């Protein structure tokens, strides 16, 4: 079987670690708590082949910079997440793209945007903007709701057959 | 470059060296070495080890105790700040404000670092394995004292969830699914009538059904501390691994009472539609993934009473003697094929726990626990990271849950499940004996026949579920 | 060329584990993983007559008593261990013996008594008695200390002998 390392990137509070604990455990993780740096395990068949997923969960504060740096150089695909209802993560993207850009000294990067927290009502930013991002960077635009499981696993799985297909 | 703090004020400034440790022949890996370098390793500032902190956390007790690795993360969370450069110096001593590009550099790529994993080192203790605090109450205030003495702003935020991670522990899990569970499938007994619930009566899709998520959980219980330092083998092995115990009990338990179900029959024909129902759930079982079960069901396929039931197994139709072998066949060759299967499978499934129990083991066995170089005694550290390989392997299984209703009087009818009774296992294992060769005896003695005992059809309803609800 | 299936039955910690690993294992190696293929084969020459041992060695999963019969009967010869400082598991070997009888369906099934010594606490099985108890059973009886591989090779080559002049 192929391992597939997976790092999810984005703004603190968008809801990196929900949507990673939602995939491994389906569970909802109600509670906020400041991610340092995390690592998951999942055996699953996507398209008939069986994978070993490593999803490489990171925290999105400027202490953590070294760090998240370290955590990108060996992941092979990157989940970058922002809130719907937090313009402000879907601003921070940009950096973050840029920072993957920079560390893995590449423009072709597997990748896909993801906009969190769909399941809410109190969206401020627009899919269309998003969708505009995404096509933007030559990548996929999935909304996902860690608290639903609503596109979660498309988002992941979606992931992983860029990197096959990469 | 970069300047480490003195050696003289900050242990974990000491060089390494071919006597303090040793890396495995694309992160570094450690092959052995001393408490005082692991644990700079365990908290490195140039690259992220996946699982060191796991493998650690799980493993250190037997080369360090409780209190001094809490001493030597504190220590290592104390890293002394650079003195200024001969430029700040300079600007300092002209009244004006230090540019300080080392320092800040160094802050950047040294003390958040290691700061912030000696803290993710405290937030894993803590939370996955608070066993270390229960049964240290000092070693907790310790830890209290020093997460809410971390001064700073920076910090701060984890600082703070750390500390409310602490108090929700000494205080006192919901899923999710896509779509549904099946429905409850009923056969002769209905519902809330346990006292017709039996081997034949239930459906045999339920019976899978119920008993694999009475088995998921089993092994979702099992925690790696019941594992480590192959506990499970010596004499408090009651209070070390009560859940691993109490898992494979159950197994046991199951193998025994299928065995007991079919020796029991005495009429051929209904004994083999005894042995075939119980082949239909281990059918059930291999399309849930329950290789536990499978191997319960191919165990009892396999004890000293029922594997010489030349008669029964004759009348076995065609299709379950080739699920039969196939069932079985994993096991064969020290279960190469079992292996192959539970590595391509997609999740749930209930490994069989036998495996990992015979490669800690051996594991524990067959490394020492230390090596040494030039006369000092470094911990081998390669040791700790083949047996934290098989804990990691258990524990990824032990996330996905079985998307299955429970029904509450078969999950008691299971868990309430005894065949052997008052009587000793060797006594009941005669027994069992005893009643293979009463009802098919040795030859040349010809075989008997007895009076059927089920006064309810025998037809199978199958194990294909059906779809009304 | 001829392989020879053994099996190792006894108590739990009588140290069974040990001896397969002695037996099988690369004594000047600094690192062991029974994770593996191949971890229980191993080509010996016997008698100067060549051949292939497979070591069948549960060590670990004593508690699943009602996998025994399974193991042990693809087994053609069987070494019945038991620790000399553990009264317990000497007197259980009898048990041990039956079991195998009646999973073979034979009287006579090749087998050797092994009493191993597996640390240095104080011993409690003198070698008269194990001695005395396998004239009874008209087996061979080979004392080990799997620590300081002492006996080993003996104990096992002594079972394929068992299972040729059988
Ligand atoms: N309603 C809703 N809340 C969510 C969702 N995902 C995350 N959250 C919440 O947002 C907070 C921050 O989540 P977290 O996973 O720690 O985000 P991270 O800082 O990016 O790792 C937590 O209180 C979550 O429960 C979602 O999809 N819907
Ligand atoms: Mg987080």
Known sequence: ?166 | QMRLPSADVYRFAEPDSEENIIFEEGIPIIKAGTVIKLIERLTYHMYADPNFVRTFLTTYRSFCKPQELLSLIIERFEIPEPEPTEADRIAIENGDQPLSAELKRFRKEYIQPVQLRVLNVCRHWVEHHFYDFERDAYLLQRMEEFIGTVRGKAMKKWVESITKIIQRKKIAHNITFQSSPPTVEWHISRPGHIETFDLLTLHPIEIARQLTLLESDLYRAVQPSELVGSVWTKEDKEINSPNLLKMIRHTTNLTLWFEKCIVETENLEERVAVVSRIIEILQVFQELNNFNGVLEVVSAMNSSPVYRLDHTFEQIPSRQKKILEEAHELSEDHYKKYLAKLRSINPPCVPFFGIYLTNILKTEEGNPEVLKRHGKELINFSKRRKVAEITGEIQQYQNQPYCLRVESDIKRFFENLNPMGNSMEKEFTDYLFNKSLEIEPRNPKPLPRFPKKYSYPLKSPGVRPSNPR
């Open chain 1, 1 to 166: 079987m192929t391992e597939y390392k997976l790092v999810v990137v984005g703004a603190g509070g968008v809801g990196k670690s929900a949507l990673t604990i939602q995939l491994i455990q389906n569970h909802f993780v109600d509670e906020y708590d400041p991610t340092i740096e995390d690592s998951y395990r999942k055996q699953v068949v996507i398209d008939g082949e069986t994978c070993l997923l490593d999803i490489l969960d990171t925290a999105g504060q400027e202490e953590a910079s070294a760090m998240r740096d370290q955590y990108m150089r060996t992941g092979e695909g990157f989940l970058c997440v922002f809130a719907i209802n937090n313009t402000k993560s879907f601003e921070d993207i940009h950096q973050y793209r840029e920072q993957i850009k920079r560390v893995k000294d590449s423009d072709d990067v597997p990748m896909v945007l993801v906009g969190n927290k769909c399941d809410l009502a109190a969206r401020t930013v627009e899919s269309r903007q998003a969708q505009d991002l995404a096509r933007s960077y030559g990548i996929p635009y999935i909304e996902t709701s860690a608290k639903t499981r609503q596109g979660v696993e498309d988002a992941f799985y979606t992931l992983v057959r860029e990197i096959r297909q990469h």
